[PDB]
Write a protein that binds this DNA or RNA. Structure first.
Lengths: 77, 63, 100, 50
RNA sequence: GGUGAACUAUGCCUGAAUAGGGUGAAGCCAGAGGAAACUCUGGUGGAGGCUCGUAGCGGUUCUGACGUGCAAAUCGAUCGU
RNA sequence: CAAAUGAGAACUUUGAAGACUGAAGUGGGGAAAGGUUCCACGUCAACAGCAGUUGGACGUGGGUUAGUCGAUCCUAAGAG
RNA sequence: UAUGGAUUCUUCACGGUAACGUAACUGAAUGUGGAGACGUCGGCGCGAGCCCUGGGAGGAGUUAUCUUUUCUUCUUAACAGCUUAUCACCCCGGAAUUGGUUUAUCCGGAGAUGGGGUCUUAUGGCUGGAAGAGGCCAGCACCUUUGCUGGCUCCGGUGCGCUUGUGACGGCCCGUGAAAAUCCACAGGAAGGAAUAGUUUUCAUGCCAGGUCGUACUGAUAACCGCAGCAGGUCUCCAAGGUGAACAGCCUCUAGUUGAUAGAAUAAUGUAGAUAAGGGAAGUCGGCAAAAUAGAUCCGUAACUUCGGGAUAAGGAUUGGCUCUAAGGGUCGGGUACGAUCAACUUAGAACUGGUACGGACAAGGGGAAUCUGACUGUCUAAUUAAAACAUAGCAUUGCGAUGGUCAGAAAGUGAUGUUGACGCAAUG
């Protein structure tokens, strides 16, 4: 229920020490008529809020999923 | 039998009127056995209970 | 502006049941496509091609799946083989005539 | 009414509990002349009007 | 000596409800005639315990139905607002 | 109109048809009032001014879940 | 209740000319101010939902013939950020040739126009919530309280439209249309505070808890009251299409119901609804009852009048369908006097046409000349009287200056008028 803008903000939120679960949702939206791309939504669940980071770059999303710590519970769907 | 309960349940389950709910005359026994919302949904999926189409109100003459 | 929308119509089931005439079906489609309100004005806009199992209609003018279905059902009613053929779309613009 | 008070609801509960017919075995009890509940109530017939 | 304002009468407090038309008040804008004073015209606007008329509220007539009634006062038409 | 149920069907259930209310509804909810009438199962002696297999009937049971909706708090006319 | 952030050797922040802005950015006693917090009507503007409509992607219907067709799904909550405003306000400037401007005529040397900005966030848009949900489709293992997999869920337009909310306004009043809890803010400056750490819990994050009672159902031609499952009575919210001025009248979608003892026949007399030659109130207490009139457009409209009315006076003509004609708008501009998308419903006109019909059902004034009476609107005898009766504004009279008038109480260290004061209160006609 709250957007995230920058990867630094995402990183501080994921180390906020009260977040443990991230949900990765894949949306197959359209940017242009002939270019349906793969949008990734990283949802960090804090105690009070649900922060969501939108990533339109598949490479950026892959590096994000690889760079988040393996101790946090990541759920891709 | 007495399928008043099943008609009411089918209307409430499929979100239409009892005037739209159609119950199969040949499946009276199965519909009567079906006493829960789960069983009414099973019958609706199975085709024993079908929504009748909305009665037509054309706007051709108005147009 | 000048995109060529394509429309696939599978006719495999009735043509292999041998009760259908896909040649006459394509003829009906091409002679009854209405462009600008009149038939026969397929000015290299709406083109019907048939291979014996798939009818492909390529269009640049106004065409729609609703029109394709309406014409197909008109043909089925004319050949009184309804209750035997159903016009159903599997995915976008790749419809099919089903027998079962 | 839907919005009741606890006093009214307690009276409702007491009335619902009291509205039941005779247990069968009191009839067989010895020296007994009670045959039915003569204080039986129906919601349409008699209003308790509390 | 007590009990009643759950009907109704009246006051107060706190809420709620009331299509569509007709007419066209003040205010205002423009124009014409005239020597002037002024007069006149066309618009605008939208007043009224105004008016036609729904919902509503009431209850004129039929001295209609009914009158051992649906009803210890209702029903229908016609009416008032 | 026809099936089903039933000893028994003008009246119950289902299907079909014909209709009506026609959105200041014969619809969907609530306030006062009612008090279980809600729902299921069984059942028709009485009751539904005909009937009844049906029911707001009879018998047995099930059901009402709140920090956020109300009450609760405030004050009004007033009461005290 | 700790952490991060902010502040601190300029102790309790900075920026902006300003309206004011930001993540924070001490604030006691005491005082003060806001919100709570308010009628009604009218048009205008905006938004929400609904209605209407174009394309496209599915499903259904019709298909003797016609219809790129008819019906139908294409949805986005609370909540969090960015953005979004009429009004209002600020800076520059200094206006008659007065300009700006609303549908409504108000506003400017107490500073208009113009240029530039600030704020409220009604409200909308974007993103998150959220497509993972819901919905619409197609298919899979063969009796069995079983699921699974594929697609799609998109882009617009329009308006004196309906209803609701909001805004800026205007009208009305001898009527000017609650209070309190509660919350915040401001004035003031008590008190306290440095440095490997103090303050800030009005900044962000993080921890815990939230009790009691109601909650089912009807809400009525069967769940309430009327002795009943009684044609009665009983408060309110939502509100589709067509016709049409219209939430009446008629028909239809969603939803609901098809309930009211039945069968047969069709005598009199009834109840309810109609029609009638010629006459046209001769009937009768009396035109009781019924009939005629009736919508809209155009023409035309008397006596009298308190000049406002009378008045829809009276009295005439027209009204369909089809094919056209004309007028009435919005948004996009200028070498190097005018053009194009965007089809919106009003008005007027002309032929043509028909068993002269056409507000074709529905809906829907009869009118005039007078007399009596009450000015009018309004009120009453619930269940035989709605009236000329009552009331009314207007007029007049009466009492009373508070240790008072009028009235109440058994009394009262008691009351109404009176939160009053002669432009008042009280009492009458």
């Amino acid at each position: 229920a709250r957007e995230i803008t920058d990867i630094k903000q995402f990183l501080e939120l994921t180390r906020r020490a009260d977040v443990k679960t991230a949900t990765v949702k894949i949306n197959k939206k359209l940017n242009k008529a002939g270019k349906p791309f793969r949008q990734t939504k990283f949802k960090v669940r804090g105690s009070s809020s649900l922060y969501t980071l939108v990533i339109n770059d598949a490479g950026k999303a892959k590096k994000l999923i690889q760079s988040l710590p393996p101790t946090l519970k990541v759920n891709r769907l | 039998a007495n399928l008043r309960t099943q008609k009411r349940l089918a209307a409430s389950v499929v979100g239409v009127g009892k005037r739209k709910v159609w119950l199969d005359p040949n499946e009276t026994s199965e519909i009567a056995q079906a006493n829960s919302r789960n069983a009414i949904r099973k019958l609706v999926k199975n085709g024993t209970i079908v929504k009748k189409a909305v009665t037509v109100h054309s706007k051709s003459r108005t147009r | 502006q000048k995109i060529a929308k394509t429309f696939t119509v599978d006719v495999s089931s009735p043509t292999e049941n041998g009760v259908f005439d896909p040649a006459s079906y394509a003829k009906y489609l091409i002679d009854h496509i209405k462009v600008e309100g009149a038939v026969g004005n397929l000015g290299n806009a709406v083109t019907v091609t048939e291979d014996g199992t798939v009818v492909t209609v390529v269009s640049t003018a106004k065409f729609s799946g609703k029109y394709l279905k309406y014409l197909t059902k008109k043909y089925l009613k004319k050949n009184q083989l309804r209750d035997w053929i159903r016009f159903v779309s599997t995915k976008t613009n790749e419809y099919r005539l089903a027998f079962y | 009414a839907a919005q009741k008070s606890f006093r009214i609801k307690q009276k409702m509960a007491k009335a619902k509990k009291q509205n039941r017919p005779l247990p069968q075995w009191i009839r067989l009890r010895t020296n007994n002349t009670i045959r039915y509940n003569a204080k039986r109530r129906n919601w349409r017939r008699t209003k308790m009007n509390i």
